[PDB]
Design a protein around this ligand. Sequence first.
Ligand SMILES: COc1cccc(CN)c1
Ligand SMILES: [Ca+2]
Length: 223
Amino acid sequence: IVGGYTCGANTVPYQVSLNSGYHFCGGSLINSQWVVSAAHCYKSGIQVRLGEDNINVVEGNEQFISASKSIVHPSYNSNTLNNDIMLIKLKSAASLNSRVASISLPTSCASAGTQCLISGWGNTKSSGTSYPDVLKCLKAPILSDSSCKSAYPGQITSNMFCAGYLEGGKDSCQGDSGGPVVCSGKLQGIVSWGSGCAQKNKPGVYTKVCNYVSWIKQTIASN
Ligand SMILES: COc1cccc(CN)c1
Ligand SMILES: [Ca+2]
């Protein structure tokens, strides 16, 4: 997260870190045994880490649970990043509490202008590299489809939305991938892609979660 703020420990209780020896992606807890992330975060040997603030220190509220299975969206295209969504099932159910909690799926798609919360442990610099160890947060509006399409000609599908600031300076970044965009207490987006971070006229692009609710529910119900 570039240009954000320190969230505060366990203030984003649905935020998870995906760890394969090291943090590589964010995700969102959507019930006691399932996480939603980006398809481009797919790999083997994933451990889900819940209740994290400082990802380098065991602070006392963590639950570490290995993934039993990952399910990448059947229509995911890694070139265009269309359908950039994947489900991860936990080997055992997380113990839910005030600091480890699921986030509700949307019943409706959020409109342009809606304020949302984007969070992650990604890079905090727009040039060069610095990784925070504590969770960072950014409040950002959803942008209009037209402004999003104008920013990225030929690349925005009906399964994507832009959020952030056309002026730059505030954005998601490398390592935030797969993490939440939450608006009015619902998971509306997943950190997917962009052109660099916090650059003028290159806002972050997010997977449009409201398009996948049926797939998520049906997949969970049979797996
Ligand atoms: C360039 O790497 C990125 C990864 C995730 C999200 C974003 C959005 N600026 C960028
Ligand atoms: Ca920790």
